[PDB]
Structures are given as structure tokens and as C-alpha cells.
Amino acid sequence: RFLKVKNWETEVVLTDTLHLKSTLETGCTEYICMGSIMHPSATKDQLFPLAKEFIDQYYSSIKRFGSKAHMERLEEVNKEIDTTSTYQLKDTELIYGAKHAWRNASRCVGRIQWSKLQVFDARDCTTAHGMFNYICNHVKYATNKGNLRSAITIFPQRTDGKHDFRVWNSQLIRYAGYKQPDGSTLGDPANVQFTEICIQQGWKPPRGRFDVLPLLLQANGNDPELFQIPPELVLEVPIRHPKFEWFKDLGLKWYGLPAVSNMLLEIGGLEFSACPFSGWYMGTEIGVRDYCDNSRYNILEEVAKKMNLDMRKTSSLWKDQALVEINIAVLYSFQSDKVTIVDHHSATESFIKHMENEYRCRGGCPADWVWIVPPMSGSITPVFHQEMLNYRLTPSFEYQPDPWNTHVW
Amino acid sequence: CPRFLKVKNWETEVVLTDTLHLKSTLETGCTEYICMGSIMHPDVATKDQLFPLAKEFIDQYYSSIKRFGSKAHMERLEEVNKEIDTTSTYQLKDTELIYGAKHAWRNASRCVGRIQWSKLQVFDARDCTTAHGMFNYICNHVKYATNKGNLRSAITIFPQRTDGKHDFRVWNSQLIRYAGYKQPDGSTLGDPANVQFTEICIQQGWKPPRGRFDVLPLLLQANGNDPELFQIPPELVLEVPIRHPKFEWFKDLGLKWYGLPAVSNMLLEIGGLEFSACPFSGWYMGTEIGVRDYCDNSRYNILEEVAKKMNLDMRKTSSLWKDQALVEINIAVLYSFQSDKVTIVDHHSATESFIKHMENEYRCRGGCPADWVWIVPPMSGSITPVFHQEMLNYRLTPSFEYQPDPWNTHVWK
Numbered sequence A: 001r002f003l004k005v006k007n008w009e010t011e012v013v014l015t016d017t018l019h020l021k022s023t024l025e026t027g028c029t030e031y032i033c034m035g036s037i038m039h040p041s042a043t044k045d046q047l048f049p050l051a052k053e054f055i056d057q058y059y060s061s062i063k064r065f066g067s068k069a070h071m072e073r074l075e076e077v078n079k080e081i082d083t084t085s086t087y088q089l090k091d092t093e094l095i096y097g098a099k100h101a102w103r104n105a106s107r108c109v110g111r112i113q114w115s116k117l118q119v120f121d122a123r124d125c126t127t128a129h130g131m132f133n134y135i136c137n138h139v140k141y142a143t144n145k146g147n148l149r150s151a152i153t154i155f156p157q158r159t160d161g162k163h164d165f166r167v168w169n170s171q172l173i174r175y176a177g178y179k180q181p182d183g184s185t186l187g188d189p190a191n192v193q194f195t196e197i198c199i200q201q202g203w204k205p206p207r208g209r210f211d212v213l214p215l216l217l218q219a220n221g222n223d224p225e226l227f228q229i230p231p232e233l234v235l236e237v238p239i240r241h242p243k244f245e246w247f248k249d250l251g252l253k254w255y256g257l258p259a260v261s262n263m264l265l266e267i268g269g270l271e272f273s274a275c276p277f278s279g280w281y282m283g284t285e286i287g288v289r290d291y292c293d294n295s296r297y298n299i300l301e302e303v304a305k306k307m308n309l310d311m312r313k314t315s316s317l318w319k320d321q322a323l324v325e326i327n328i329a330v331l332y333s334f335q336s337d338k339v340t341i342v343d344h345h346s347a348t349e350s351f352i353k354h355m356e357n358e359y360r361c362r363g364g365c366p367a368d369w370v371w372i373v374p375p376m377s378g379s380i381t382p383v384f385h386q387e388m389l390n391y392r393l394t395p396s397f398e399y400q401p402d403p404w405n406t407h408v409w
Numbered sequence B: 001c002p003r004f005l006k007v008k009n010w011e012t013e014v015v016l017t018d019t020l021h022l023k024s025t026l027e028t029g030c031t032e033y034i035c036m037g038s039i040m041h042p043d044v045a046t047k048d049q050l051f052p053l054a055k056e057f058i059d060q061y062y063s064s065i066k067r068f069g070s071k072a073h074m075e076r077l078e079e080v081n082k083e084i085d086t087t088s089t090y091q092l093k094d095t096e097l098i099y100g101a102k103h104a105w106r107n108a109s110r111c112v113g114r115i116q117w118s119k120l121q122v123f124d125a126r127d128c129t130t131a132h133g134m135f136n137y138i139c140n141h142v143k144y145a146t147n148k149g150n151l152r153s154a155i156t157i158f159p160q161r162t163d164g165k166h167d168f169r170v171w172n173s174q175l176i177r178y179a180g181y182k183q184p185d186g187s188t189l190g191d192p193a194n195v196q197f198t199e200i201c202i203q204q205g206w207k208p209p210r211g212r213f214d215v216l217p218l219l220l221q222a223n224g225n226d227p228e229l230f231q232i233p234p235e236l237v238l239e240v241p242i243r244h245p246k247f248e249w250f251k252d253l254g255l256k257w258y259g260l261p262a263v264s265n266m267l268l269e270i271g272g273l274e275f276s277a278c279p280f281s282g283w284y285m286g287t288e289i290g291v292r293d294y295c296d297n298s299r300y301n302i303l304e305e306v307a308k309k310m311n312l313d314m315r316k317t318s319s320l321w322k323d324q325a326l327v328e329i330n331i332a333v334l335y336s337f338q339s340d341k342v343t344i345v346d347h348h349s350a351t352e353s354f355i356k357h358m359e360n361e362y363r364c365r366g367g368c369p370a371d372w373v374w375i376v377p378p379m380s381g382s383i384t385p386v387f388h389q390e391m392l393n394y395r396l397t398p399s400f401e402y403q404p405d406p407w408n409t410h411v412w413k
Ligand code: HEM
Pocket: A098, A102, A105, A107, A108, A109, A110, A111, A113, A117, A150, A151, A152, A277, A278, A279, A280, A281, A282, A285, A342, A347, A371, A397
């Protein structure tokens, strides 16, 4: 059936037909919705229909469905799966696939940029040193002296499951976290466990609040190896406030490059277990989640002190006041340092425009309202009032297990 | 369906286990291929449809009072079936009515205030026959619930649906709301959300003051008849002038709001019986007024005016001038209610209470249906504990349901 989605602020109604194309599950059923669950829920025979489906939509996308090239490609892939239990994507197909996995990422508010993605083919990589080289080039390219460019580097696909390429870091660039004798945490508490694995492997920790973690890289199923990213490739921003001159004295900084490195890219049945991808930050990612989450840097109280706020009752909204000033500081700092960043008002605006584009040209746009709506000031951004349909389209980015739970040394 | 579903809290790592979802009775709107979790809204019962619905409810009631399988349970079942057989409907006992109303609230997945569910004053108005009688009952409800500012949650329940042509309806979506007036120049005076209803009232005879905060009259339909207008006695309408503890100029914006949130357009469904007029009221969470009523672009839309008086830079969105004004507006709302000693709850306190409620329900009941999209407040979401809490949404009965607007369906006599 055709599905309507309405914006309750503009009263614009869009019609979704694209959802009929989905074949994978969402996790919900007719009687139970799991819209707020973070993580809900090959062989030659499974492999061909998936490959065919993907080849079909690729050739449909270049207006040559059923062409001679198309027929030949299907045949070629058929033979290759027969003979080898897998197949290799053409360069054009790899790039199409990566851009579309981004396009189909229902949890990403930044998708208006989807067709501008620099794709680095790293499928000839065989070793951890090789991976390091490719990752450095990625970081250097994507960083671009502050003028951030979206990029993805794609390492060899899964074969038997015992020879996986994995970036063990959840992101390429992150700050270490340390468990103190007194039981508190120094640095980022989210990375305490990963930091410990790096230490256990030989990494000598400076034990600061913002120590960039080393890369831990696994090539072809082997034990991961440590590498320090050359520091001149790591762009950082000292956080200050345009009004509160005491803010710089908090000693806060963050890195300019958000680069997810723990997801799995799926294209036509093939699985790319190492595919680090990067864009640029939305201010709230740092200002709200990284700094103000209770389980992260957790700075609200200190900031509220410096602002001399009344902090005895919740109803003074001291937390909300402090939260806003921190996010002003993040945006101001990045902007003043000419490092690409987008505020949640601008980002959500662009996303609404993107939705409108996709509905017109594609017949829909899968979107996860729980993730799309920013973690502050929700209803004063346009996505809060936008109905969205969530469904799973392929090619796609998928979660995968942490490598330290499925690896034998 | 799996017998046990797990929900995680990503802040605390606490894992809870849901079994209550197995009692789900109606569709969410989702399927295994699509989720409609952010969709707002995704001829009577026949004898044969009614039997198992009544039995399911009666069983639940007698199970709740630890008399399941008792002689009184079996007798009540037989009496109910006999009534359905002879009359195609049945009547609830007062005890069952009260149980059903409290459970419809307990089951309302979109409500963050459910920690209070077992404390609800239920007014049985099933003997009501006329619009004048409806008015009396509604006035008594408003006075009781308001309690001079110490608000008490309450529901008044009018006669259930019979053949569908004799419905009792409150035409107002809430008992107390402000009028909206569209101007010839395209501007709106008052609350833009209420323009349609306001036009209906005017057509029905209401003389409008044409102000920014005019309390709408009640439009009351009894027994399927044409609806009639009544003015709520102004002394029964508690209102709060909004001022700010720091900004002396804030009171000069001339804002105020009413103290009692009272939903009057929902259908209460118990044991297959449908109560099409069941106005219920509680007390406000500040953000309902400070974020939605005042700051929605399609409502009073005051962010700009507040921003200008705050001397904020408003040329770039990146200054977060909107977020800054939003916080000060919400501070003022909470400060004004507390000062006038009218019950209100801030979004931090309410969401903290809701998490405790949810944990208790998982413990004692096997679960707690919750709609995250609605439970998370419209500002500062992730600094409230609910943002980090996975929730399962499913529909249990007794329940409050949406129903079409009466002016779209009414047959004018
Ligand atoms: C270019 C600027 C971009 C912006 C402003 C942006 C914005 C965001 C934000 C704010 C999130 C939520 C992150 C969180 O809360 O953890 C997100 C998630 C996501 N993004 Fe984007 N993004 C960008 C680029 C990209 C690119 C280049 C890709 C892939 C090629 C991508 C794919 C994804 C995926 C798969 C998620 C979901 C992550 C998860 O489920 O943990 N994004 N994005």
C-alpha cells in the first residue's frame, strides 16, 4: 500500500512507495513496536539472489536495465559464485554501493550529502601496516586542514569469517578513558575497556583527559597491531565561549573528525567488516552527548558552578541553561578555527529538504525519528514535527560484534 | 512472539524483561518491514464481538482482586453474558468502571505521568441525560480537580455508546482552551490551534470577546442530539500570569495560561464498551506550556519576541538564540505556577518519576508499554533519563483511543 507521512507544523503530506522495496526486518510486529530499541532482534545459494538484486538496481540506476552489459554482468557474477563461493564488485559498483548504504542509513541526519562521498578502494590490502597507511591517507584527505570532506575506505570483504579485516577502534579518533584508584574516571568513560586492551597490548598511556587512542588494526584474521596516528593528521579544537572568558579554563577540547570504524558495510550479499567512514560533526554530538551525558565527560555541574546558577532544585532548569552555553561554545570554537561543523537547526532543516527531494525522486526516505531528532531543543527543530517511516533498504551499514568478543588470539 | 523481550537503559546498563506484551490486544500500525513509531495516528459491537471482550475484562478484574475462579467471578460472567444476549450490551458495576478507568490510564503508552495512575477520582455520570446535566457534571469535575491550585487527577464518565446515533460527546478537545481568530489579513489572534473549533462555536451563537486568551465555551452533545453551548463560570477557571524571576520585563509580554489540562475528545474503551465522552484531567508538565504552547511556530510562537527582549544575536542559528530563549521561557512558566501554588512538574522530575514507575511495573506487572517518541520531553531530551531508556510500545485494554471529530460525523437534526 501507499503510505502517507505528514508534517504537523507545515501540514505537508508526502506519499511513500519506496518502502515496498524492503525485504529485511525492522524488529517490530503488528502488536509490538521496537522503534526505541538500539539493536533490535553466507552460502552460494543465499548469495546469488542478493547479488542479482544489487546488480539489477545498479543497472536500473544508470538507465540500462536489461542491457547487454547488464546481462553479461549477471552471467559473470553467476559463474564467479559457482567457482569461488563469492564474487568481486566492479569499481563503479563499489562506489554506487557505498553511496547508497549512506543514502539508506535511516539513523543519519546528514544524508543530504550522500552523493558526495569520496570512496577509497582498499581491497588489495593484506596486512595491518597496509591498513594503517590507508587509514592515514583517509584521515589526511577527510580532514583537509579543517575543510572536512566525507570519505569511506573499504577493506577486503569477509570470506570464511576467520580472516576478517577489522578496525578494533569504534571510531578512528577517540580519547582514552582511565579507571582511577579512587573509582572515578579520567578521560572518556565510554572507552575505558578499549583503552585497557591498548595498554594490555603495549600502549604506554600518558594518562590525560584527552589522550588520542592508538589504532588497533586486524588484517586477514590475525592478531591486531597498534599504531600511533601521526599527530599532525589529528585536528583538534580548544573549546571556548564567545562571552564567558572563564570557559577556556575548563580545558576542554575535541577532535574535528567523526569517523565510525566499527560498522559492517553490506553490498549485494558481500560483507565489508572494515569500512571506516567519516563526515563532519553536528554540534550536539559533542556539546550534548560527549560532554553532558552522565556516562561520558559529564561536565554540566562544573559549568553550572562557573555560571553561578542556583542548583538546589531541578525546576530552576540550571541543567538546561548550562547545556545551551556549552553547545554555543562548541559551535563558536569550531567556527572560529575554520573547522566544518553544523548546528542542529541547520542540520535538521537540510534533512527536511533531503526528505522532500527523496520523496520526489525516489518515492520515499527511510528515517528513524528516535535518532534523527536532536538530543536538545527537539520541538523547535523541524524534524520533531515530521512523521517518518523507518524501513531497511540494501546496500546498508549494519552493526557487528565487538572484535574482542569473537576473536581467538 | 517470544515470551521474554529485554529492554536496556544505556546510561545505567539496567536490563528489564517484558512479558506483559503477550497480552497485547490491538495493532501498533507497524509491521515486520516497516515501523510507524513516529506516526501520530496510525456501527457498534455485535453480540458475538462483545462476549469475548467482556469476559477478557471481567477475568482481568477478578484476577486483580484475587477472586479469580470464585463464585462471584463465575456469577458475574453469567450475568454479563445474559445481558449481552438479551440486550446486545451490558452495564459495568461501579467497581469495574473505576478499575477500568484507572487501567486505561495505567495502559496509556503516551503518558509520562502514569506513576499517579492508581490515584484517580472517577466520577460516574452514566445517569446523565441532557447537555445541561453534562455541564453540571463538567463544572463539578473542574472544581474538584482544580482544588484551588492543589490539582487532583480526575475523570468523569458519561453514558456508553448504544447504537452509535445517540453518542454523548464533548466537542471541545480539552475542557479549557483559548480561542483562535483568523483575520482578513491572514494573521491569527489567540491560539492558532483552535481556529476551526472557535469558528464552530461562533456559528453556534457564541459572542467572541476577540482577545488573545479567551476561554472557549463548552459545546456539549448529549444522547446524539445537537450540541449546546455553555460558558464555564470564570471563577472555576484557574489561570497563571507568566513572569520571570530575573527578567522584570517578562510580565510585560502579557502571557498567562490555564492551570488544568483536561482532555475531552478521547474514547474510553472498557470490556468492549465504548465511552465516547470521558473527560479526564491531571496537572501540567512545564514543557507542555513553555515549549509546545508558547514556542511552536503554529501556536503562540513567541521565541522571536523573547529573543529580542533578551538582546540576543539572532542573525545566525549557530548562536543558539532560539535554545537560549526557550530555556528562559520554560523557567518563567515553572516559576509562575510554583509561585501561585498551582501544581506543576518540571520535565526532569517527571521523567525521573516515570523511570521509577516503569521499573516498578516491570517488577510487579511484567512490563510497561511506553511510546518513547511521546515520553521524551520536547526540550533537553538526552539530559533526562527517559532518552536513554529503551521502551516497548504495545496496546493493552482498557484503553483511551482517538475518535473522529464530532462535527465531521454529526447528523444535524
Ligand atoms: C557529512 C556530514 C554528516 C553529518 C553532519 C552526519 C550526522 C550524523 C549524526 C548526528 C548521527 C547520529 C550519531 C550518533 O548519535 O551516534 C549520524 C549517524 C550515522 N551516519 Fe551520518 N553524518 C554525516 C556523514 C555520514 C557519512 C559520510 C556516512 C557514511 C558514508 C554516514 C552514515 C551514518 C550511519 C550509518 C549512522 C548511524 C550510526 C549508528 O547507528 O551508530 N554519515 N550521522
